[PDB]
Design a protein around this ligand. Structure first.
Ligand SMILES: O=C(O)C1Cc2ccccc2C1
Ligand SMILES: O=C(O)C1Cc2ccccc2C1
Lengths: 269, 268
């Protein structure tokens, strides 16, 4: 992978692996999400961010601040097959004092055709207190050096799906998967549950018949609170709709504290 | 990746990814195992095996036969760090009518130093009845075309660890992790639990203090029966000693054995 000519975005190619594909012999949405994470991390390393596992700037480390994901939104038009090469371009942009965004575009490397796109929203947090806060001027100035100054959005459309408010699912859920728990492979280098694991947990409560007859087109997921390595999660889903739509909720198995909420949209194969 | 000059082995390089590393910022043993699986599948594709999830020969498809893993044995001397390049060479060899072996050698791509090695034993099974079988003359002849004819072993040492018998752990286990279950990401393209998932389940019952103070040097794992996608597993571990452990995976309800194994760990 490498930064582009203007130094304001980064591109990397990936060959889809045998163990990364599902039933259709195409990459799962969790494989796609892991590739988005990887190209994002390689871009951060290329522009001087930390390699400790939290990717922080110089001012962030002094003030014990970290970035945390607030939302992930992915839209896939075609999933790459085993052995195919996918090229992914990624870039960041500040959004004033609210937080920052990392966007991605996925392409079929052979044809140059766009096969997917994604956007993520990040908020600043004190690493010790876990309290959210606004982005300071000094941090905003560091971002200006590696981000485009004119808006560059993977989702330009008017008041598009990526910014839509997600409601809270009401009991009883139509479907559920209970007692989900992370194993060591689900943790990152800092012993936190990997963001991609929550996508897998959301999808666990989609009935197998839907997975067999449809393809996932869109997933939007809010991150409210972390699942700790000793926590247990219940995954709830209710149909809201030739396209099937679902509302999702992940909550702690005991007291029912919300950890994530989301929506998915699926198209018949 | 590519077949070597003599067409009898295959090599591929991998750049270690951010999400593939553990606390030490080095690749986990499950990441290593996934890379061994990938280079094995790319080698099978390069010599004419099927690309439908079950790497099968022409005479195996006719008779509805598949290969199933009986044992995996991995020894790691150094784990590659995030961003490092590891080169892996793999090859197969028939073992008469018993079954076949796939072996691997892992190297640091920059220095050429061997950083790990692995060996796996495979047995033939009828895909419909699930009944184990001996290797027929016609399949042995097909293997002879892409395998070295003189013995080539990743583990040559006299009566070495890779062939050692593993005993069955007796209750009460010293440690346990119960109620483990596969999610969709743990399944392969044919909806079977991926072989690497069982390694993760074995390791779940190793106390966190050991993982924090030691590095895994050797893991030997027998595969007795598959965990179905709707099954629940208990992972049991007992110290037998460097720290050494005996492992057992069994169904959460009736206690049917699915795997047994051993691990050896060295202090960091
Ligand atoms: O974690 C990251 O680096 C981003 C990529 C990714 C993939 C799945 C969910 C959230 C996010 C945010
Ligand atoms: O499944 C395979 O292809 C082989 C590689 C691998 C990795 C972990 C456990 C078993 C095996 C056998």
């Amino acid at each position: 992978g490498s930064l582009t000519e203007d130094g304001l975005s980064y591109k990397e190619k990936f060959v889809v692996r045998s163990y990364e594909v599902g039933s259709n012999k195409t990459a799962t949405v969790e494989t796609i999400a892991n590739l988005l994470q990887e190209v994002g991390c390689n871009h951060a390393q290329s522009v001087g961010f930390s390699t400790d596992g939290f990717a922080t700037t110089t001012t962030m480390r002094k003030l014990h601040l970290i970035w945390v994901t607030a939302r992930m939104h992915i839209e896939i038009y075609k999933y790459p097959a085993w052995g195919d090469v996918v090229e992914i371009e990624t870039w960041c942009q500040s959004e004033g004092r609210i937080g920052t965004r990392r966007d991605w575009i996925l392409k079929d490397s052979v044809t140059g055709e766009v096969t997917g796109r994604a956007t993520s929203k990040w908020v600043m947090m004190n690493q010790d207190t876990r309290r959210l806060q606004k982005v300071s001027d000094d941090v905003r100035d560091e971002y200006l050096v590696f981000c485009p100054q004119e808006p560059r959005l993977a989702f330009p459309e008017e008041n598009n799906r990526s910014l839509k408010k997600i409601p809270k699912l009401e009991d009883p859920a139509q479907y559920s998967m209970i007692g989900l728990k992370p194993r060591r492979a689900d943790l990152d280098m800092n012993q936190h549950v990997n963001n991609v694991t929550y996508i897998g947990w959301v999808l666990e409560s989609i009935p197998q018949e839907i997975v067999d007859t449809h393809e996932l087109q869109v997933i939007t997921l809010d991150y409210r609170r972390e699942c700790q390595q000793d926590d247990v999660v219940d995954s709830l889903t209710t149909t809201t709709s030739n396209d099937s739509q679902f509302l999702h909720l992940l909550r702690l198995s005991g007291d029912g504290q919300e950890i994530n909420r989301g929506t998915t949209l699926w198209r018949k194969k």
